[PDB]
Design a protein around this ligand. Structure first.
Ligand SMILES: O=C([O-])C(=O)[O-]
Ligand SMILES: O=C([O-])C(=O)[O-]
Ligand SMILES: O=C([O-])C(=O)[O-]
Ligand SMILES: O=C([O-])C(=O)[O-]
Ligand SMILES: [Mg+2]
Ligand SMILES: [Mg+2]
Ligand SMILES: [Mg+2]
Ligand SMILES: [Mg+2]
Lengths: 278, 280, 283, 284
């Protein structure tokens, strides 16, 4: 019964509240139904999980925009809670970002992130790098132009592990001024790190913590402007382990995250990158 | 490194052997990779698991042929064991059948089954199309084939119709040139034995863990090469996802089995309500 | 600028005018942009043409719902005029009909037709018959239930050619009863025929005439309640002929004397599909 | 009748002959059926034409690999002549190239081109810049590794317009050494330009000429190793103009003055895409 637009209103309501919320990992229609049934307030479609499902591949931007959108569209037919799409770098330059936004808003997603990582991996650079802030600003501005339903939330994402706090403040302030509805940060260490970045932000914050034990004080998160916390996709690795255990028993022939990692053939992709990209 | 054609050769080799093999449930790339790691000889992409994956929907012919093919294509990019696709009734009449063969063969599947169930549910029951129509769908499938190593398997339902009629159909399909026969609903080694008698092509059983059919040396002797135990591996995954999120939430979780859980999130009463409302 | 919802308001606003409208054939992004630039009020995405573009195939329900929705989706990204999708039989029973509406409404189309033709062609029966009126009413009800944006127009279509006029009036009334926003008619012979049918409908009418000279009168049509007229897909066949003639001239080959419709039919390989239908679908 | 594999052998036999062949523009199943009926030896699916068909958009790498592949798949269900796919840069880095080859091969294409253009366009940087030759070699070697059917023809494409002859010579030799099956060249000026680049190649050449009148001589081209000429995608433009002409006369509008190509460009909304590039991809 909630439409794509109504789901966007619900998400905005979470953001205007004075609490933060932990996302359920929602990657397909079954998991979306599960999350809603357990009473989760919002979910997240991760780019990493889409890449496991479509391709059994590492999180290397191998999936195409169409493939990511098919995943989102399948979730959008059944989702009764608002779903955030991790939309990587927008699948190209700022013109590709427009299309990312059109496709995902139509798929029925409640909110999406665009991040300023230089993707896909560059020739010879075994470093993960960020695009210049000027490019990043144009991508956020491009995303906001492409939006049709103004209830859609556009979250600018950056990586605070890569760069120093003063560059994170600079970029995130620039994205706020560009019109971002929220700021998403990955790589934040602890509360001192967070307070330094949160100080000059007045739009809601989204945190990708991957179960960081030094960011478990939710009351403190919320009063620093954090509304959404993402801990990762254990629920997907648990499904992979279950499938394996069942088949292994049927046959008579590693943790869950190690098992999921193994089936991405990381060594094969690592050999290709060495042989063709360095 | 094995091509789509080589996997067809490997599957034919199993059918020519003296043994019968038990499929792994293979519904996506991760599962295809797990099945091969575990040493399975062949895999099976069931229409019902595609329906849960794409739609969280019951096994009601709701997925389009393109969706079903998308699932098969994703598998074909990684599969190192031959995989059988359950292709339902071939997604329409005999001319639609030719498209399903073309689509699934290109996606890289090793064998497919075409069943004579009248799908989708007619405005009735689980009926069967006439034997003449079924023969013509099989001849059409075999025509549509390009790679001759591709195995075309003709499927019928034995649970309902009397064994004469099953003997009747399956003989006609054998006559029409099918590479093998797929049987669902066989009761026991006696019932198998009857249908098996006048057949010289490989047999495939969808038993669903039927306890009365567990002798592999004996199924083989009778001409069975492939046994499909079901899709518990898929339910395990749903349960596991549910359990992890339920723990994360601090909610207090069901006492449903992996299968009752899977069925629940298929919303079967909505679909049952719509059928009663719009198709009665 | 105009959103999928605003296009639906425009289409509703046409159906509530006292005027008749002639569709442009809108089959892809470029044709949609052409048709808007020319001032057309609405377009139609025909299933026959989707089948030409996707498959080079006759109009035999060979294309999948997904393929058809992909065509609608492409159009939806550019369309500044409202577009009607010919959704054939809803790609299955009433359960499939519901998916058909969900998919096409999400694609962005302003209106869609569900017809009561028995599809795909069934075994033995060399003619193409209609589902019983009750399966028809169940289909139409399921379509309306599946709709989310109430501004989406759901149109019930039937064939006024084979079955006698009374059987027709019966079907249309039941559809109108069932809650259809409009009726679509194929194979109306003439105004005598139309008037019989128009008489006890009060919901907007749409006509697929195929150029029928007996129905050429717009003021009259509108007074009878017709709001949309589909003349066909000549603009697609013109594209086929232009591609043929350009390549023929680059090659240095002799001219063909087939017309644009003739060339388009030829490239569907109709004889091949016929041999298969005789070989595999007749006793 | 001809399988995807059989089509590749037919393509290879063109390459092995002593003649140059002119592609038909083949962008969907009806056009593939037309080209075959007319007796064309081979066809070409242009990425530019895919962008017009899927998006009504200019050739700006806006189409996804999945969209390109769907176009190529439609064609592959009916093609009776070998079709070359213009695969742009492989839709990302060398690892994306692998997937490009996988998808188009399975689609049933006879041959594909991978170009060393830096794509998509860079924030301010320059839309026609090339990647370094080392990255180009890695992309070519990745395509060749990704190939399953050995009959598939893999062509390394470069742009001779803006870089110097010695640089084209360097890149083409290195793609030849990397094992490319052919070399495709866009932006060749004339026979002297061509002769310099052709001189140290021994694999078949493909030329994208865009009607360049300084390169019209089949015998003379074939003697330099040219096997395939792509003259452009006029046949698509003609199909657009025909649709325009038909609806406009249906409407009662005045006849258009614009050529087929002018009218096709108009409906890509070039000014809109240009304004967006200005506003979002240039320093403020
Ligand atoms: O890709 C992911 O899973 C993410 O960034 O959350
Ligand atoms: O649908 C299924 O899962 C089957 O028949 O194996
Ligand atoms: O398919 C068509 O073109 C129609 O029914 O209008
Ligand atoms: O894109 C094109 O049309 C080409 O590169 O030939
Ligand atoms: Mg991610
Ligand atoms: Mg099944
Ligand atoms: Mg139609
Ligand atoms: Mg190109």
């Amino acid at each position: 019964r909630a439409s794509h637009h109504e789901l966007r209103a619900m998400f905005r309501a979470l953001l205007d509240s004075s609490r933060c919320y932990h996302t359920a990992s929602v990657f397909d229609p079954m998991s979306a139904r599960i999350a809603a049934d357990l009473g989760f307030e919002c979910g997240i479609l991760g780019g990493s999980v889409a890449s496991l499902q479509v391709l059994a591949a590492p999180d290397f931007a191998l999936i195409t925009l169409s493939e990511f959108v098919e995943q989102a569209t399948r979730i959008g037919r059944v989702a009764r809670l608002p779903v955030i799409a991790d939309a990587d770098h927008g699948y190209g330059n700022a013109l590709n970002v427009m299309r990312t936004v059109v496709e995902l808003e139509r798929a029925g997603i409640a909110a999406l992130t665009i991040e300023d990582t230089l993707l896909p991996a560059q020739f010879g650079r075994k470093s993960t790098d960020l695009i210049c802030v000027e490019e990043g600003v144009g991508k956020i501005r491009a995303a906001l132009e492409a939006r049709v339903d103004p209830a859609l939330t556009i979250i600018a994402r950056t990586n605070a592990e890569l760069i120093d706090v003063d560059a994170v403040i600079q970029r995130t302030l620039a994205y706020q001024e560009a019109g971002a509805d929220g700021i998403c940060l990955v790589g934040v260490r602890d509360f001192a790190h967070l307070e330094a970045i949160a100080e000059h932000l007045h739009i809601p914050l989204m945190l990708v913590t991957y179960g960081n034990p030094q960011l478990r004080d939710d009351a403190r998160l919320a009063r620093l402007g954090v509304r959404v916390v993402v801990n990762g996709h254990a629920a997907y690795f648990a499904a992979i382990k279950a499938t394996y255990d069942c088949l292994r028993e049927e046959r008579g022939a590693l943790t869950a995250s190690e098992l999921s990692k193994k089936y991405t053939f990381p060594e094969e992709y690592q050999a290709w990158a060495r042989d063709y990209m360095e």
